[PDB]
């Protein structure tokens, strides 16, 4: 599900004008918002204006700085990494998000266009073929786990 | 400042020109043509916009365009001429849809395509302007030509499929320069024999990926570069990355028939000795600090990775040449291992690790991972929250049907207006040999709607064969025969008690709430619905809602629904009091589902209920055997097998919970016992 | 001297299986295509059957059919074998001598 | 035409696909039919194909039969691509006019809808006359709005033809008021349809302010129409598929349907609206007869209202005299009594009379060019000005007059006032051009006006910001989430919270939207005549290019004249305005032959 | 760059030089693609006949000509004496098996480019002509600079040192050499060459003091082995600096 | 366990960058030539590749226009315009370009100028305006403090009778078509395009190069002046139009060298 959430976030960053994709991407499990927060965001127009402005800033960082600076600024401003580490079971999700971010950086450094990386991510979502780099890694190494 | 490999000026344009040079060897798959149309130069040559490409995506996907430009291309590849699922078949289909509506029928065993009808089918006239050109060079680049005839081949191609833009001037200039250089170097030897297309294509593909590694040095920013550019330049801080085994030093296999590899001399180029001297020059050139970093541990399975032989000899010379002042006289091998373990810094695997933020020798400067490593943040709160909601006066019946079809989806896409949009499926690379999924369901639905009026099934067979949805030859006839047999077996039960009925109006006032709507095909016997599906609880809930909204204003009689595999949903006629009570219960469930997400699973909750229900005594059993079988039925219906997509594999349920806890399972069980109970109570 | 290595050969194998299904199962009549449909629904089931035999070393098939026997000759042979039993049943009908 | 000679590749590929191995006559006929359908012509007469084609003796010599295929009908019917309407063929030839199969089906559907289903609803005439006397206060002379309301409430299907400023919305309000006051106990689910969303919003606000004025009852206010819907939204059109919710099985549950602006309704949308109607709904069409044609291929309202010049019937004149209680004239002759009875013509304009030159110029557009020259010539009626535009000094004079046109807008922009007065001052003056690019177009005039505001100290503009204070923008695609429709104007300014665009909603309020939330934004200093339909401006100024173009025709100049409320300016040559009146955008269709029998 | 400087000295010293060489890599590949089917009937090409005449859509022939042109370009850069002997028609004793199909191919290439209108000159023969016209000339030719600095080891590959010795007779050449060791650490050929190496000493540029090449001149014969390889005391310098050994040799 | 992230006390590096001058900022006639950056670089490459001693050949101009991709009709006007430019002398004594031999010319000389002090625009523009007479108008540009190296590419440096001269080429000239390119219009173009700082840095670089190369060097004895050549302003009857000769006051160079040194 994290690849689909990253695809929704990239579609909301690339096209922030239509509010449907932005509302579908903000209510995912990566952001971690309740239904009351989504309702107050849909009711208050100034908070939605601030959200559209900061997503336009994220789009400017995505067009100027790259993929990993935009994702790092999104994880630092929204503070979603601390919320995923505080949530029980979110460390595997955070490592999957970081691995998807590294693969998107490696695929977007070789692609000139910005929508081409989103098309590549959607194609790799639609293609479940297993490569050596596109497999799941270990979630944590310090904590001892039962190895199946 | 990164001194790396130089990026191409126009990367998709060169790949598109390579694919255009690989035209007679290509199979003309629809994805390979849409990837060529993805380039804005080829789209701007034939006046195809991005909205036009977005229309052409679904126009190719829905009209059955899979592979093959012409029928002669199908016959050329040692394949039988089917005549369908080609680019000519799709072009004839789209032009017949521009001319004739799809409800008329076939003209030359080609069903028309009712989408492209107005001026937007002019974009089809752009696409037919492309593929014909894709025929011509297919007949142009097939035969071998001498080197004096390949000169106007590229340039007349460049004004064929490409348009000169502001960015792609240098790309076309480089293409013309490399092509003329290839032809000039070929004609300098005065080659007389014929040269095929694949040799020039591979020679152009080799001269477009020859971008040399950049060696530029900027004195301002910090220089990120490879080993060779500065070999002996004396920098103060020298860092060496990627010193693991296998990667560095590079070893290149000998050609096998070169005399220099058999007998080496002093001044001979070798990549191994050059890298082993580059490491020594980087060791000498370091003035103040040397920082050697390598991958010592894998990130996939945490396997031990060995470093290079040069770094191993370096740490061996360090351990055999130096000692720590702690153990001044302990041993030689123990002191060597202690020095090699003291100099080796085993860093953490993740950047949010609290080991990296301890004060002392090693401490990171990552301020973004500082509150994440301290674990001083709030966790993810629960998604279900009590929201304020006022039930309006006029609630339509369609809103209640969309609510009781899927309650969590109706809580997402209507209350807070969050609808998770999934991307559409890609176009398959072959014709459909079997029928499965949505196409089979649409074929069964149209066949059931045609056989319910005693229409000619052979005309619908020819209509489905003219569109390409059926398999070619006798297999489509066999599929149509078994589906016609199944739908005739279903229609012999459907039209056994079918009466002509019309749509009627529904106006109800329950709990001060107005319900206005329409019921289609209301016969005096009752309610008659037919769908080519399986026995499920969602269709039973829909029929129960229609029966409640039908019996509340007159309408004495039963309600019947006939699915496949002899499945039948029956509801007897009830009085107005019980119908209004159950409708008030459904209205209370609707107004409760808008505030909080009403956790009523239809399939799994219905399976648990019908495992626990006893229709003979009209009471739920409380023994442990039923409680152990209902858990098995709930786990079978929630998470399915490897062939059936279960109810838990859904984008609407993964947002609420990631793992099905037994507390939420008992909550879903209680909600299904509260709501889905008259479904199995009034079933017969 | 220079060749490109592909990691997954499943797409080319499925393409060759689809080419075999097009060049074999399409010009067959109804009486043979019914048996072909009874054996496999499509080429995907055939590929699922022979995917462990297409890769690696080709095994030796015990008692292989001759090279001149096509599907129509085998169908006519089984049709004649059924028709001989049908003729012997129609000739010996109308009597029962078993205890 | 010039565009008709330059063949599109769609028509050539369509001819090569349909004809194929047939005769080149069928190829040329299919290519000419596809090229005429691309321009908007519904039917193709065989006389034009026989006479105006140089390849006619070549195709006469190419065919070889016993009867030699001298007629075009035998040569088309000999091929497998043209039938008489029985075989599923792409091309249909029935009445010596070749069309496509879809166009033939839609044309026969429109002819069946306007020739057979239009029956006479018999109601009480005394109560109808009493409601018309109590609703219309004028009863001294002949009033066309009362006759239009009577002939709309009498028959089931009725077409009301009238120009802007003639009080059509007041006529619709009086018609709906008399419709509800006639049928008291019977429920009436009134529905309103519009082709565009902005015209739907204007229709909702106009019918609301018209129906809140008339005195109603507690149950009469309950049967007030709720909203005006788009024709793609009323029938349930999908973006992906063409499947409708109310296509052929279940009709729309309506009692009366008022479809405003039928001039922008093309033939397939008209046929899809006709196929969705039940056997008891009464439809009232609104639109102007001489207005601009539809967007896609087809001309429905013009071919319907072409029979309005003949008049009514002899019995229908006595019926209207018994209903309205006045003297209603009769039409000489009878060709199609149902269509001539269902039509009406509005001539008395209320917002402008014979004292103003705008209505006289609009009446002289449909006449010869010398009538328009005489209308502009003598004394100019203090309403219409004409400036010759040939060279660069005339362009500078046009920009100087446009400075005085946008003078109050710049004065309210510089004075830092409220945005509502700024939008109200901007909605009084408007430039209307024909083309888009080049020196004469939308993008030419907008960039020239921006360069002139950069030259003279009136508007400060940053070159790298693209969102300077004072730029007018317009939306190109609809957005129901933001509440803005296609063809709505907004003005970008800084209220103190940042540069935001203010839009004037039809509900009386103003909405401040972020420019990052705007889906589409185009500079609207000069609008196209096709995109400015439905709106109204107090001071309009038409700018026509010097080069001859098929866009500038009689209906374009008519819509440019009727766009102005009081003041109208012109920037065109004498020869271009003289040739644009005579060159009428005719669309060949089979409705004139089907309605004549 | 060193090859660019070598070509610039070739232009300045010797006149009437073509701008592009006839023995280009792609040019030799396109010549060998014509010459290899003509030599399939020869007895020495019996190994390539089983490689080429089995099945060919002119794909193996083009790759074989490209690989042979790559080997011929590498021989033009590194081994001028081998090609100079192959142009006469004599083989080289002591080489590998892959020589009976390369030397007649090189001789046929030379005869084909001499038969065609392309010039005779290539890298190796122009290099030898440059050495000959700088060794025999008494008067310095015009167009030459005064002093030439060579900074670094890889600023000149170890094949143009004979041309550098020819250029040093007329142009002062300062080769700034970056060696990690200050003593002599390379190899040796003969004991009669060891005394010639011991006679040479390094005098200082600023202090004018002579220093020997070795630490102990008496044990210099004991440091070198009988095969000719010096046992370096530093293991990293012995195992890593073989290119430095060849360059200092 | 408790943890805090360290805060960086000092900046990792100063404003160090290797910049240039651009980082601190009838039917066939040359007036009808297309004005752009690419025709300007094409004319600069034509003036760089062509030899001044050899006569201009028309087939060579046709070959250069075929290599560049321009029109073939412009060539016989282009060669006579080139020979009219080369015949016009650009000196205070009347020295043409044909008198410069191959050893006397130096085309496209690249220099790297070091600077250790933070380059303040306010302390530099006043020092420029103290001596340069063209700085009467031209309000000062704004740029950050540049410490490090400055790149420069001089078009031509040539010696004559024991005196060195600098020469640069400008070829945009879009706004002029008549003979109005007098000294006032060229001075207004120099003030608008801000070539005064580039010319002063070129004089400083040439002064440092002649001080480093030739021992016992005097700035007044060896340096002669700076010539700017506007290609579209050269006329056959007007020798003053097209060329622009300016010599510094020989006091700004020593102060600029002391400022750039430290």
Swiss-Prot record, chain B:
Outcome recorded upon mutating residue 268 to A/H: Acts at variant Chi sequences
Any coiled-coil regions, as ranges: none
Notes on activation and inhibition: After reacting with DNA bearing a Chi site the holoenzyme is disassembled and loses exonuclease activity, DNA unwinding and Chi-directed DNA cleavage; RecB remains complexed with ssDNA, which may prevent holoenzyme reassembly. High levels of Mg(2+) (13 mM MgCl(2+)) or incubation with DNase allow holoenzyme reassembly, suggesting it is DNA bound to RecB that prevents reassembly.
GO biological process, one term: DNA recombination
Single GO cellular component term: exodeoxyribonuclease V complex
Disruption phenotype: Decreased degradation of DNA with free ends that is unable to undergo homologous recombination, which can fortuitously lead to more efficient viral infection. Cells are deficient in DNA recombination repair and have increased sensitivity to UV light. The cultures have many inviable cells. Cells can be transformed with retron Ec48-containing plasmids.
Keywords, ordered alphabetically: ATP-binding, DNA damage, DNA repair, DNA-binding, Exonuclease, Helicase, Hydrolase, Nuclease, Nucleotide-binding
Entry's Gene Ontology molecular function annotations: ATP binding; DNA binding; DNA helicase activity; exodeoxyribonuclease V activity
Cell division in keyword set: no
Domain remark from Swiss-Prot or TrEMBL: The holoenzyme may undergo conformational shifts upon DNA binding: the nuclease domain of RecB may swing away from the DNA exit tunnel in RecC. When Chi DNA binds to the RecC tunnel, the nuclease domain may then swing back to its original position (that seen in crystal structures), allowing it to nick the DNA 3' of the Chi site and then rotate to load RecA. At high Mg(2+) the nuclease domain may swing back more frequently, explaining differences seen in assays performed at high Mg(2+).
Family designation: Belongs to the RecC family.
Quaternary structure and interacting proteins, as annotated: Heterotrimer of RecB, RecC and RecD. All subunits contribute to DNA-binding. Interacts with YgbT (Cas1).
Miscellaneous comment in the UniProt entry for this protein: In the RecBCD complex, RecB has a slow 3'-5' helicase, an exonuclease activity and loads RecA onto ssDNA, RecD has a fast 5'-3' helicase activity while RecC stimulates the ATPase and processivity of the RecB helicase and contributes to recognition of the Chi site.
Free-text function comment from the UniProt entry: A helicase/nuclease that prepares dsDNA breaks (DSB) for recombinational DNA repair. Binds to DSBs and unwinds DNA via a rapid (>1 kb/second) and highly processive (>30 kb) ATP-dependent bidirectional helicase. Unwinds dsDNA until it encounters a Chi (crossover hotspot instigator, 5'-GCTGGTGG-3') sequence from the 3' direction. Cuts ssDNA a few nucleotides 3' to Chi site, by nicking one strand or switching the strand degraded (depending on the reaction conditions). The properties and activities of the enzyme are changed at Chi.
Protein name per UniProt: RecBCD enzyme subunit RecC
């Amino acid at each position: 599900l994290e690849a689909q959430e990253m695809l929704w976030l990239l579609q909301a960053v690339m096209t922030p004008e239509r509010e449907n994709t932005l509302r579908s991407a903000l209510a995912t499990s990566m952001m971690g918002l309740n239904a009351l927060d989504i309702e107050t965001l849909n009711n208050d127009e100034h908070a939605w204006d601030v959200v559209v402005e900061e997503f336009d800033g994220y789009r400017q960082i995505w067009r100027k700085r790259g993929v990993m600076p935009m994702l790092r600024a999104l994880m630092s401003a929204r503070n979603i990494a601390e919320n995923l580490l505080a949530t029980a079971g979110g460390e595997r999700r955070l490592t999957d998000i970081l691995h998807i971010s590294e693969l998107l950086q490696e695929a977007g450094t070789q692609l000139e266009s910005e929508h081409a990386l989103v098309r590549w991510l959607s194609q790799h979502i639609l293609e479940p073929d297993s490569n050596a780099s596109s497999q799941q890694m270990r979630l944590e190494s310090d904590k001892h786990l039962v190895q199946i | 400042a990164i001194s790396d490999r130089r990026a191409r000026q126009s990367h998709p344009v060169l790949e598109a020109f390579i694919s255009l040079l690989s035209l007679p060897d290509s199979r003309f798959v629809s994805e390979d043509v849409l990837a060529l149309l993805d380039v804005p130069v080829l789209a701007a040559r034939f006046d195809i916009t991005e909205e036009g490409l977005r229309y052409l995506r679904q126009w190719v996907n829905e009209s059955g365009i899979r592979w093959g430009i012409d029928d002669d291309n199908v016959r050329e590849l040692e394949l039988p001429a089917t005549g369908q699922h080609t680019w000519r078949f799709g072009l004839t289909r789209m032009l017949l849809g521009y001319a004739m509506e799809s409800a008329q029928g076939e003209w030359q065993s080609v069903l028309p395509y009712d989408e492209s009808s107005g001026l937007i089918a002019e974009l089809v006239g752009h696409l037919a302007s492309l593929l014909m050109q894709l025929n011509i060079w297919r007949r142009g680049l097939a035969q071998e030509r001498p080197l004096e005839e390949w000169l106007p081949v590229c340039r007349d191609m460049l004004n064929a499929f490409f348009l000169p833009d502001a960015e792609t001037e240098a790309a076309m200039t480089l293409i013309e320069q490399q092509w003329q250089a290839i032809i000039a170097e070929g004609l300098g030897a005065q080659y007389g024999d014929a040269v095929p297309l694949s040799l020039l294509r591979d020679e152009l593909a080799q001269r477009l990926d020859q971008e040399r590694i950049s060696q530029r040095f900027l004195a301002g920013p910090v220089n990120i570069c490879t080993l060779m550019p500065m070999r002996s330049i004396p920098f103060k801080v020298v860092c060496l990355l990627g010193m693991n085994d296998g990667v560095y030093p590079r070893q290149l296999a000998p050609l096998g028939f070169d005399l220099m590899s058999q007998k080496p001399k002093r001044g001979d180029r070798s990549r191994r000795d050059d890298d082993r001297y580059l490491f020594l020059e980087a060791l000498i050139s370091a003035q103040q600090k040397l920082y050697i970093s390598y991958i010592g541990r894998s990130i996939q399975d945490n396997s031990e990775r060995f470093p290079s032989v040069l770094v191993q000899e370096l740490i061996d010379y360090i351990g055999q040449s130096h000692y720590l002042p702690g153990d001044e006289a302990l041993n030689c091998d123990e002191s060597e291992a202690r020095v090699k373990a003291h100099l080796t810094c085993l860093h953490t695997r993740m950047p949010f690790d609290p080991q990296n933020y301890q004060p002392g020798e090693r401490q990171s400067y990552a301020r973004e991972w500082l509150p994440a490593a301290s674990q001083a943040g709030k966790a993810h709160s629960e998604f279900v929250q009590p929201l304020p909601f006022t039930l309006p006066e006029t609630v339509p019946l369609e809103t209640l049907q969309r609510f009781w079809a899927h309650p969590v989806r109706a809580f997402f896409q209507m209350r807070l207006q969050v609808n998770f949009r999934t991307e559409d499926s890609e176009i398959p690379d072959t014709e459909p040999f079997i029928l499965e999924g949505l196409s089979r369901y649409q074929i069964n639905q149209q066949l059931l709607n045609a056989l319910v009026e005693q229409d000619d099934a052979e005309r619908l067979f020819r209509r489905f064969r003219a569109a390409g949805d059926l398999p070619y030859g006798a297999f489509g006839e066999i599929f149509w025969e078994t589906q016609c047999q199944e739908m005739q077996q279903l229609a012999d039960r459907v039209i056994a008690c079918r009466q002509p009925g019309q749509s009627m109006e529904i106006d109800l006032a329950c709990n001060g709430v107005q319900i206005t709507g329409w019921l289609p095909q209301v016969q005096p016997d009752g309610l008659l619905r037919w769908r080519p599906s399986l026995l499920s609880v969602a269709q039973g809930m829909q029929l129960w809602l229609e029966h409640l909204v039908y019996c509340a204003s007159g309408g004495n009689g039963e309600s019947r629904l006939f699915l496949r595999k002899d499945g039948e949903w029956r509801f007897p006629p009830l009085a107005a009091e019980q119908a209004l009570h159950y409708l008030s219960q459904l209205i209370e469930g609707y107004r409760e589902g808008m505030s909080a997400p009403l956790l009523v699973l239809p399939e799994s909750g219905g399976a648990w209920l019908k495992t626990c229900y006893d229709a003979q005594n009209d009471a739920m059993l409380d023994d442990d055997s039923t409680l152990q079988k209902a858990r098995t039925k709930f786990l079978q219906a929630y998470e399915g097998n490897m062939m059936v997509r279960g109810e838990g594999d859904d984008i609407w349920y993964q947002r609420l919970w990631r793992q099905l806890t037994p507390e939420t399972m008992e909550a879903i069980v209680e909600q299904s016992q509260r709501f889905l109970l008259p479904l199995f109570r009034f079933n017969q | 001297f220079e060749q490109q290595l592909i990691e997954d050969e499943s797409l080319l194998r499925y393409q060759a299986c689809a080419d075999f299904w097009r060049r074999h199962c399409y010009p067959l009549p109804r009486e043979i295509a019914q048996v072909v449909f009874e054996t496999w629904k499509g080429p995907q089931a055939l590929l699922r059957d022979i995917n462990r035999y297409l890769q690696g070393e080709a095994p030796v098939i015990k008692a292989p059919p001759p090279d001149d026997e096509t599907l129509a000759s085998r169908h006519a042979q089984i049709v004649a074998r059924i028709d001989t039993v049908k003729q012997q049943w129609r000739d010996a009908v109308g009597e029962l001598d078993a205890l | 035409a010039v565009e008709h000679k330059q063949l599109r590749p769609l028509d050539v590929q369509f001819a090569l696909t349909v004809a194929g191995d047939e005769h080149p006559a069928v190829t040329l006929a299919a290519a000419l039919l596809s090229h005429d359908a691309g321009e908007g012509h519904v039917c193709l007469p065989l006389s034009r194909l026989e006479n105006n084609e140089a390849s006619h003796p070549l195709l006469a010599t190419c065919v070889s039969e016993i009867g030699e295929l001298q007629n075009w009908e035998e040569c088309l019917l000999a091929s497998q691509a043209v039938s008489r309407g029985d075989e599923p063929t792409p091309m249909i030839l029935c009445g010596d006019r070749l069309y496509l199969n879809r166009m033939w089906c839609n044309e026969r559907t429109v002819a069946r809808f306007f020739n057979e289903v239009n029956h006479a609803i018999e109601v009480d005439e005394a109560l109808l006359a009493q409601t018309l006397d109590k609703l219309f206060p004028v009863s001294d002379e002949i009033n066309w709005q009362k006759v239009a309301a009577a002939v709309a409430l009498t028959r089931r299907i009725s077409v009301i033809s009238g120009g802007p400023g003639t009080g059509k919305t007041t006529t619709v309000a009086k018609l709906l008021a008399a419709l509800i006051q006639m049928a008291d106990g019977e429920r009436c689910r009134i529905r309103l349809a519009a082709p565009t969303g902005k015209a739907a919003a204007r229709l909702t606000e106009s019918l609301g302010k018209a129906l809140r004025q008339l005195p109603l009852t507690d149950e009469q206010k309950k049967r007030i129409p709720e909203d005006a819907s788009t024709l793609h939204r009323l029938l349930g059109a999908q973006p992906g598929s063409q499947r409708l919710r109310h296509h052929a099985g279940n009709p729309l549950h309506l009692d009366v349907l008022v479809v405003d602006e039928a001039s922008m309704i093309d033939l397939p949308m008209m046929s899809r609206l006709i196929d969705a109607l039940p056997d008891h709904a009464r439809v009232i069409f609104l639109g102007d007869r001489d207005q601009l044609a539809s967007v896609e291929a087809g001309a429905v309202l013009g071919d319907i209202c072409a029979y309005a010049n003949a008049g009514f019937t002899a019995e229908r004149a006595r019926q209207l005299s018994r209903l309205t209680g006045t003297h209603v004239p009769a039409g000489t002759g009878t060709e199609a009594a149902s269509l001539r009875d269902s039509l009406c013509l509005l001539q008395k304009s209320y917002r402008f009379g014979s004292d103003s030159g705008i209505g006289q110029l609009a009446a002289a557009i449909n006449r010869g060019d010398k009538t328009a020259v005489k209308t502009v010539f003598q004394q100019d009626f203090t309403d219409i000005e004409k400036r010759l535009l040939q060279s660069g000094e005339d362009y500078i004079a046009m920009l100087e007059e446009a400075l005085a046109g946008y003078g109050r807008y710049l004065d309210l922009l510089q004075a830092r006032a409220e945005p509502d007065l700024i939008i109200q001052a901007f909605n009084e003056y408007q430039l209307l051009c024909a083309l888009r690019e080049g020196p004469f177009g939308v993008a030419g005039l907008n960039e020239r006006i921006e360069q002139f505001m950069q030259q003279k100290r009136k508007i400060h503009r940053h070159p790298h910001s693209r969102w300077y204070e004072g730029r007018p923008v317009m939306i190109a695609r609809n957005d129901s989430a933001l509440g803005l429709f296609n063809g709505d104007i907004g003005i970008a300014l800084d209220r103190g919270q940042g540069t935001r665009v203010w839009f004037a909603m039809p509900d009386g309020n103003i909405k401040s939207v972020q420019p990052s939330r705007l889906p589409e934004h185009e500079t609207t200093w000069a609008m196209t005549v096709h995109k400015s339909q439905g709106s109204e401006f107090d001071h309009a100024a038409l700018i026509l290019p010097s080069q001859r173009t098929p866009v500038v025709t009689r209906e374009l100049v008519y819509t440019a004249v009727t766009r102005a409320r009081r003041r109208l300016s012109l920037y065109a040559d004498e020869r271009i305005l003289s040739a644009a009146i005579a060159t009428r955008t005719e669309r060949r269709s089979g409705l004139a032959a089907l309605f004549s029998s | 760059l060193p090859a660019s400087f070598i070509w610039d000295m070739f232009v300045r010293v010797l006149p009437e030089i073509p701008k592009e060489s006839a023995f280009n890599k792609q040019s030799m590949s396109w010549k060998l693609m014509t010459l290899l089917p003509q030599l399939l009937e020869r007895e020495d090409f019996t190994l390539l006949r089983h490689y080429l005449t089995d099945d060919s859509d002119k794909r193996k022939l083009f790759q074989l000509s490209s690989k042979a042109a790559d080997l011929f370009d590498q021989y033009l850069v590194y081994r001028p004496d081998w090609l100079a002997q192959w142009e006469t028609g004599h083989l080289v004793e002591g080489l590998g098996e892959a020589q009976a199909w390369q030397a007649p191919l090189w001789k046929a290439l030379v005869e084909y480019t001499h038969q065609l209108g392309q010039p005779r000159w290539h890298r190796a023969n122009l290099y030898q002509r440059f050495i000959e016209t700088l060794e025999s000339a008494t008067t310095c030719p015009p167009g030459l600079p005064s002093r030439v600095f060579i900074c670094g080891i890889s600023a000149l590959p170890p094949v143009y040192l004979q041309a550098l010795q020819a250029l040093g007779k007329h142009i002062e050449i300062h080769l700034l050499f970056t060696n990690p060791c200050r003593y002599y650490w390379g190899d040796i050929k003969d004991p009669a060459y060891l005394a010639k190496l011991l006679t040479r000493q390094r005098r200082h540029s600023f202090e004018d003091r002579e220093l020997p090449l070795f630490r102990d001149s008496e044990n210099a014969g004991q440091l070198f082995n009988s095969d000719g390889e010096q046992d370096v005391g530093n293991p990293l310098l012995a195992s890593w600096g073989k290119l430095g050994r060849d360059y200092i040799y | 366990a408790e943890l805090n992230a360290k805060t960086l006390q000092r900046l990792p590096g100063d404003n160090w960058r290797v910049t240039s001058y651009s980082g601190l900022q009838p039917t066939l006639t040359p007036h009808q030539f297309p004005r752009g950056a690419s025709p300007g670089t094409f004319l600069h490459s034509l003036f760089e590749d062509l030899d001044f001693t050899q006569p201009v050949d028309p087939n060579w101009v046709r070959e250069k226009l075929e290599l560049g991709g321009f029109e073939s009709q412009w060539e016989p006007v282009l060669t006579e315009w080139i020979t009219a430019v080369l015949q016009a002398p650009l000196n205070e004594t009347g020295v043409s370009l044909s008198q410069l031999s191959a050893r006397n010319k130096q085309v496209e000389m690249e220099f790297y100028l070091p600077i250790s002090e933070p380059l303040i625009a306010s302390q530099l523009d006043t020092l420029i305006r103290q001596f340069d007479p063209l700085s009467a108008g031209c309000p000062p540009l704004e740029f950050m403090q540049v410490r490090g190296m400055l790149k420069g590419f001089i078009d031509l440096v040539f010696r004559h009778e024991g005196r060195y001269y600098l020469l640069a080429y400008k070829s945009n000239w879009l706004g002029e078509d008549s003979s109005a390119y007098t000294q006032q219009a060229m001075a207004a173009a120099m003030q608008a395009h801000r070539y005064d700082l580039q010319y002063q840095l070129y004089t400083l670089a040439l002064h440092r190069y002649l001080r480093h190369r030739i021992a016992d060097y005097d700035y007044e004895h060896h340096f002669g002046g700076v010539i700017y050549l506007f290609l579209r302003g050269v006329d056959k009857e007007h020798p003053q139009q097209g060329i622009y000769t300016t010599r510094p006051n020989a006091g700004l160079i020593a102060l600029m060298d002391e400022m750039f040194a430290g």
